[PDB]
Amino acid sequence: NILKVIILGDSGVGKTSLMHRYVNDKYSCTIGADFLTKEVTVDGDKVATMQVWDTGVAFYRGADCCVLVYDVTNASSFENIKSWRDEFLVHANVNSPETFPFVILGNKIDAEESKKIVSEKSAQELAKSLGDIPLFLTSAKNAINVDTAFEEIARSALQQNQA
Numbered sequence: 076n077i078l079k080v081i082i083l084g085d086s087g088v089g090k091t092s093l094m095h096r097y098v099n100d101k102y103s104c105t106i107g108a109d110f111l112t113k114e115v116t117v118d119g120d121k122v123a124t125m126q127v128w129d130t131g132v133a134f135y136r137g138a139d140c141c142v143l144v145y146d147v148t149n150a151s152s153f154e155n156i157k158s159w160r161d162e163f164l165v166h167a168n169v170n171s172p173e174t175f176p177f178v179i180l181g182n183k184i185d186a187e188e189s190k191k192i193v194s195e196k197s198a199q200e201l202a203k204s205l206g207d208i209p210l211f212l213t214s215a216k217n218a219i220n221v222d223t224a225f226e227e228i229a230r231s232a233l234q235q236n237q238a
């Protein structure tokens with residue numbers, strides 16, 4: 076029924092921006108709401124409501140998917156991806172750590188090339204080493220790939236929700 080999605084990653088990577096792009100299709104250069112909600116549409120039907128939880132017992136409870144976000148211009152954000160994945164599994168008490176879904180987002184892909192520091196290859200290798208986690212490279216700013224990425228986040232959440 077309701078899909079709970081958590082977004083983790085270092086501060087400054089674009090977690091809040093990606094949520095706003097997904098939820099409201101906007102971006103500019105929310106206090107008091109623990110989550111924002113967006114109706115998921117698949118094949119032109121409304122199938123479910125997604126809660127997107129941006130950055131605790133009630134915090135982890137009920138999570139259906141976990142999204143991990145680095146910034147392709149910040150090397151340290153990328154090196155911390157496995158830490159965030161691990162921090163989640165160690166605290167969230169999920170029914171089946173073996174099968175719980177993560178999705179990795181490499182954000183700010185709109186940046187000039189000279190400012191990119193993390194290569195696509197390195198990210199594909201890490202996503203693989205972590206259990207073949209889906210990898211998307213994204214731009215909240217320019218609306219690049221966030222639709223396709225959340226399409227897979229929603230699909231992962233739906234599968235976990237109904238398991």
Ligand SMILES: *CCC(=O)NCCCNc1nc2c(ncn2[C@@H]2O[C@H](COP(=O)(O)OP(=O)(O)O)[C@@H](O)[C@H]2O)c(=O)[nH]1
Binds near residue numbers: 084087088090
């Ligand atoms: C409009 C002026 C500007 O910020 N220019 C730089 C564009 C670089 N490209 C870019 N920047 C992004 C993207 N998403 C988010 N941002 C920027 O990152 C910081 C922090 O974002 P936030 O969403 O607050 O991160 P956390 O919640 O993870 O802390 C902000 O400057 C935001 O504008 C993106 O796709 N591309």
Ligand SMILES: [Mg+2]
Binds near residue numbers: 090091129
């Ligand atoms: Mg934020």
